[PDB]
Design a protein around this ligand. Sequence first.
Ligand SMILES: Cc1cc2nc3c(=O)[nH]c(=O)nc-3n(C[C@H](O)[C@H](O)[C@H](O)COP(=O)(O)OP(=O)(O)OC[C@H]3O[C@@H](n4cnc5c(N)ncnc54)[C@H](O)[C@@H]3O)c2cc1C
Ligand SMILES: Cc1cc2nc3c(=O)[nH]c(=O)nc-3n(C[C@H](O)[C@H](O)[C@H](O)COP(=O)(O)OP(=O)(O)OC[C@H]3O[C@@H](n4cnc5c(N)ncnc54)[C@H](O)[C@@H]3O)c2cc1C
Ligand SMILES: Cc1cc2nc3c(=O)[nH]c(=O)nc-3n(C[C@H](O)[C@H](O)[C@H](O)COP(=O)(O)OP(=O)(O)OC[C@H]3O[C@@H](n4cnc5c(N)ncnc54)[C@H](O)[C@@H]3O)c2cc1C
Ligand SMILES: Cc1cc2nc3c(=O)[nH]c(=O)nc-3n(C[C@H](O)[C@H](O)[C@H](O)COP(=O)(O)OP(=O)(O)OC[C@H]3O[C@@H](n4cnc5c(N)ncnc54)[C@H](O)[C@@H]3O)c2cc1C
Ligand SMILES: [Fe+3]
Lengths: 265, 265, 467, 467
Amino acid sequence: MSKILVCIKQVPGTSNVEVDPETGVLIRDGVESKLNPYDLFGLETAFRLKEQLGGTITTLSMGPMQSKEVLMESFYMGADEGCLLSDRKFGGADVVATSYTLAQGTKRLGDFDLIICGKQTTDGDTAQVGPEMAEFLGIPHVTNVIKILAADEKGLTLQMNMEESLEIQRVPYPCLITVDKDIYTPRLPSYKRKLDISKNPEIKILTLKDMYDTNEKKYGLSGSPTQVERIFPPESNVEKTSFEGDGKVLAKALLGILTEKKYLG
Amino acid sequence: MSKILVCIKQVPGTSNVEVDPETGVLIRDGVESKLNPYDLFGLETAFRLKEQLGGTITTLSMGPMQSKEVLMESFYMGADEGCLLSDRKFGGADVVATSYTLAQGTKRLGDFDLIICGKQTTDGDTAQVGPEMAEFLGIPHVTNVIKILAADEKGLTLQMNMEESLEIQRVPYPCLITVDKDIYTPRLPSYKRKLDISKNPEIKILTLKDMYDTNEKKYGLSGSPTQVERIFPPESNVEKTSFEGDGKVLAKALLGILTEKKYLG
Amino acid sequence: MNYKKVEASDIAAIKELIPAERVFVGTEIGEDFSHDELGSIHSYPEVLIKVTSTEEVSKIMKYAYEHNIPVVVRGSGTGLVGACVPLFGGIMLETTLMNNILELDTENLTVTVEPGVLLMELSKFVEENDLFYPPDPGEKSATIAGNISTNAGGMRAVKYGVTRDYVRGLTVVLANGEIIELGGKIVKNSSGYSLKDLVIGSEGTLCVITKAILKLLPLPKMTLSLLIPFENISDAAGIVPKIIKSKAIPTAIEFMERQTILFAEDFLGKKFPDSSSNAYILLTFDGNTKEQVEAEYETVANLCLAEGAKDVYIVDTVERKDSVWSARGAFLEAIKASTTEMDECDVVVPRNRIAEFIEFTHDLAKEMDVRIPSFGHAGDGNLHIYVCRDELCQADWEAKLAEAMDRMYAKALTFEGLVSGEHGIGYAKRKYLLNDFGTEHLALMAGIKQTFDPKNLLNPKKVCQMA
Amino acid sequence: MNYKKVEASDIAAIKELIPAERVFVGTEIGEDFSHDELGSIHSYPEVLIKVTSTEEVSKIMKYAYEHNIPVVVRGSGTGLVGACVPLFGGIMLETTLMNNILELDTENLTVTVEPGVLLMELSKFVEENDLFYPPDPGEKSATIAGNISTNAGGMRAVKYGVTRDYVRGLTVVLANGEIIELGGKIVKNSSGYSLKDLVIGSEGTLCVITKAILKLLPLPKMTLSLLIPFENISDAAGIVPKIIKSKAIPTAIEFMERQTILFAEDFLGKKFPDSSSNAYILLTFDGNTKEQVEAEYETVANLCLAEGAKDVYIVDTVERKDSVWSARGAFLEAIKASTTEMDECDVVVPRNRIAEFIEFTHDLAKEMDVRIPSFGHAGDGNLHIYVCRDELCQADWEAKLAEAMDRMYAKALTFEGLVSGEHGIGYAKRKYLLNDFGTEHLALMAGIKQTFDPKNLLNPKKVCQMA
Ligand SMILES: Cc1cc2nc3c(=O)[nH]c(=O)nc-3n(C[C@H](O)[C@H](O)[C@H](O)COP(=O)(O)OP(=O)(O)OC[C@H]3O[C@@H](n4cnc5c(N)ncnc54)[C@H](O)[C@@H]3O)c2cc1C
Ligand SMILES: Cc1cc2nc3c(=O)[nH]c(=O)nc-3n(C[C@H](O)[C@H](O)[C@H](O)COP(=O)(O)OP(=O)(O)OC[C@H]3O[C@@H](n4cnc5c(N)ncnc54)[C@H](O)[C@@H]3O)c2cc1C
Ligand SMILES: Cc1cc2nc3c(=O)[nH]c(=O)nc-3n(C[C@H](O)[C@H](O)[C@H](O)COP(=O)(O)OP(=O)(O)OC[C@H]3O[C@@H](n4cnc5c(N)ncnc54)[C@H](O)[C@@H]3O)c2cc1C
Ligand SMILES: Cc1cc2nc3c(=O)[nH]c(=O)nc-3n(C[C@H](O)[C@H](O)[C@H](O)COP(=O)(O)OP(=O)(O)OC[C@H]3O[C@@H](n4cnc5c(N)ncnc54)[C@H](O)[C@@H]3O)c2cc1C
Ligand SMILES: [Fe+3]
């Protein structure tokens, strides 16, 4: 409703990734980076709410100056203004330091009625920047939203799914939401919207000097409780096993396999 | 011999030119400008003398900063160093002011044993910058050289042609020569020389401040005695005329046409 | 004619030539070998033989020639016009065991394949070696010699062409068992009559292809697609000459109307990224660098927006391409899921007559009260048109199918188009070929089959027979 | 066999169908119609008819079929294999009066031409409309239907192909007078046997082409050439698979050795721009902007310098292009000016076997003491090879020409190449086609000519006839 913030991230253009056995750094094939597909559902969820409520949409990103391309890409889909959080002191961050500098950049940009984060990224896959960001903002949050039933000017009626149930909640503004995969089909970036002159809104860049808490102990690698120790390819093995001898000689072998994989069948 | 100067010019890439009836300026199709083909024979004449005498070859051009491309183009054919004469006070010049600023740039670059100008340009077609340039330098000059018979370290034995004769002259150094069309086949610009640094040379630009006569009354449009009044397409007409009636009724009509075109036959 | 029925003495003489593990008689022949994807005609062969070599094919064709037994060659059984159905029930040669890729010549950029190499495994093999087989028929489980015999073309025909443009050489076996090599690894050919170009498109009625040499291209690295909405199909088909004349040739030019997209949305369960318009042009550009593709698509996108397009949508990522091309790739399955049964039409028209023919099928569907969904390739004129029976009774369906097919094949005759541009003639479209071409045109085709096959054994009553 | 001589009653019946100013009999034929550029065979026709319409051709073919008179069609008389020479001396149809360009379809990018439109005036016409006819045979005064009947290809075949890839439709007249339309303005074709692809390359032995629809491309604006010296012809021919696999496809790839260049320097009077090397590769790139042409040649020039090229010379100027391409364009006339007479061989080989065949002609020239200069197109495998008579007497020349031609056509048979790639078979190369292809391969070709022409009237004893 009215003011809507969308947190988008630039990810590697493909996840087909392997590590050199003694570099310790990933063997990314190229650098054709893109906006992640899970945040396209978060952008599209904001576009359906703007067509119903008529407010504005702000996009927010944290990364290098190369991440300005996904802010221009969200502009071609219909975002109104953007904001980069580019600084050297913000790099090397885990979820706790990323969700802190995203919440600090939110308070600098003013109040928003709704913050829409995606389900997860495609490089980190932690799916937890969203719930951590709403803790620093102090707002309520609902994760895994598959359907918006009502879009009242004071709050939303949401459908949050579990593995086997559908919770229906009525959350008021201000709040964070985390939509998941295939809530809507995301619209494509228009070339007509990119032919205006460049981009109507200008990407407002923020550093550590612009934050209301300008102390570098809570950002970047200094404010990260976790760190990677080593990254390695996952050990997978294909074993072809045959089973003959009919009766329940095969049925004990099939139940022995289905219980070893915890299907209990 | 040793020091050799070659005056080259950038011309329009094609001479298919028509004027707008009331602009007064040339209807040039595009600007894929080139080095003129008559100066390729002047560059090739210097290359055969450098392979026999072992000196150096300097290229000299007068024009805008766009004329630096034909100085780099002569480098790919095998020139050793170049010099542009780019200045705003040099533009609008006729032959008398062009051959003066080319002779002033020659005295700034030191002494040369031989200056090789081409026969003519393809835009001006006046074929007279060469003889005027050697007057300001005070050196002897020979125009329309079709063959170099001897290439002694003190002077050249040349073959200057007329419409019906071949003058053989022995001219000493320093001197200017003007070679004409098809004295040699000019070599092509090598791509292997293009990948050296970009080329080793680094064009040395000269302005009016660098000349030994630094007074702008003798350069540009101020030192030009001539000026164009108007330029217009040439009026040509095709008339199909038939002649029948055999005998010398056709032979008087053929002799009447051959004498009107001054063939006298 | 007087074809000899296969008796038990012919089973024994065949099993001396072929090992008995690859000969199937009677109930060993499955139901899948009695039809292809046309589904109207059904006929069992008497012997099913899975061949493995050229000399095994020539031994069978020598036996059937001296004993007057008809022979039908079969690939994957994928063709849509009844071309591989053994109407007289003789020998069926089945080539899916010859799936070996014999040689990859990286100097001549050719590949030598056996008949029965699938299209999904040839295109996977050459793209691992950074090469490219440009013809892309919609079904990838088709054999290569099935694509050669039907002259199979697809989406990339606006830029690259069809299977005929990439057949360098063929080793064929005639009806009497003679082995003939037709082309080679050469590029230029002006030596005699192009017998190779008669085999391409002959649908197994002249000879049995037992080896093929295919021309390959260097594989383009990058690919980017465009989605251009239009107001109607007349504005969408009209931009295609202006796109090609701007020297930025797309790899694929697809038109799709809104009513065909609504079928694929219900089938896939996903909405199309933008269906606020009635007609769409779906382009594809390829190249080697990002800046080369960017100069190609911005040329056409500036051209489309200046000629009445509502928008131009950039389809650049893998997830965006799979959101748009899985809709286009499921047009055929969504039409089949929405009807009881259907029958199809693949008329090619001149490219400037695409919009008049698509608007004609809308007036025909409204008048006959049948559903006629349609799509096709806007860059070459081939239109894939489907008449659905929906809930019609059996006598009313055969009356409405015959009237809708006769009026669409007569209108494509008036538009100076042909009967088929992809799928071929086979058994189903023989009457419309006799309406388009004259009797003197089909007497030249029948006299050519009498040259290659004088005893009329290789696939009788197909294409130019009993038209 | 059974051929009726043209008598005075046949002259009167022909002059009722054709106006008498376009019928030539006896002494008003002219010596130019008794031969073509082969020069070995000479044979006058009895009647020369300059036709002007399709219906005039069909009335002549109806008369000659009824009265058993052989018919030879003639274009400009340009072909090099004796294909348009009337060996039995019947009717000669002459098409250079049908030089009208009938229609330019800018929507379908096609042009409809009459047989007798010259290649120099068709390519001038379409390039005024920013269109492009890609096949470029070396002689521009050739009839377009002569290029179709011979499958004439040229310099641009490495990127664009030959005349066969650009024939969209044909209106042909059979030997009995029947008018047949073969293709159309369509792009895709899968309806029946490709009878159009039999006419392409048939050399007037099947039918008389009376209309053609040709596919056009958008015209490229920029053009740049590269001249790359090499140490020998083995290094020059070996760079061609690396150039094409770098995805910067040249428009033309020409190899020229130093011995052939020395002929063109003596003929033109000007030296080649750089002849300090023994072999050369002359490339050509085209495009629409100067920057994408610059990305194309710098890809190949950075490539070619890495595999043993001495240099790469940029040919970017209209004066520089005329200094290099008039030397290549005068290779044929320089060889003719250096000898008394010569004979031409135009074998096509696989592209990896170009250097071994060029080195074979150097060992053959030293062994037989004849001058064998050669050039060709390194991008497709077609080699233009000439055996020069020089100063041999007539008995020694006929024995040395027959030995040098037999060993070169047998070596191209061993290399798995063909007899001709450009010029055709005609009358001269008939026995080499019987050596390359078997008797069963030529019985298929002779049975196809029996289908189109059962009375054997359209051009007897040519291509397959009496090989
Ligand atoms: C291999 C690997 C493993 C890691 N493991 C852990 C771990 O176990 N624990 C941990 O705390 N950190 C971990 N990190 C660090 C962290 O996940 C990332 O480095 C970085 O913080 C991106 O966050 P994310 O991918 O977890 O976001 P997610 O939580 O996966 O994404 C949720 C949503 O938050 C938003 N968002 C996320 N990142 C940004 C951003 N930079 N700018 C704007 N919006 C954004 C998007 O809307 C996104 O859809 C790991 C990193 C790597 C490379
Ligand atoms: C349409 C037209 C008509 C003109 N008519 C006249 C006229 O009647 N009288 C007159 O005095 N001027 C005339 N000019 C001016 C003059 O010719 C040119 O403007 C300019 O000076 C170039 O000289 P050029 O073409 O005459 O050189 P040319 O004398 O034709 O060339 C001789 C050689 O001098 C060298 N050279 C020439 N110009 C340069 C240069 N700029 N830099 C380096 N080397 C150079 C080259 O080696 C060249 O081959 C005319 C100009 C134009 C456009
Ligand atoms: C879903 C679907 C999509 C399709 N899309 C397209 C498409 O986009 N474009 C298109 O062109 N086609 C398309 N087709 C049909 C296309 O014709 C077939 O996919 C294919 O061409 C036939 O190959 P096959 O191996 O399936 O042949 P079969 O049907 O088995 O054989 C087809 C014909 O080829 C003959 N034949 C097969 N092998 C040989 C051989 N070795 N020698 C001689 N004759 C032989 C058969 O006798 C028969 O005449 C599609 C079909 C389906 C079902
Ligand atoms: C100097 C030179 C260079 C050449 N360069 C090349 C080259 O690079 N590439 C190349 O391929 N060829 C080349 N050729 C030969 C080439 O075959 C001819 O130039 C051309 O193809 C023949 O056309 P025409 O009009 O000259 O035909 P003609 O010789 O008159 O006819 C050739 C054949 O076509 C038949 N024919 C002509 N018109 C019709 C018609 N309407 N219907 C049916 N049959 C018809 C004739 O009967 C004969 O069979 C060259 C020839 C010369 C002299
Ligand atoms: Fe050639």
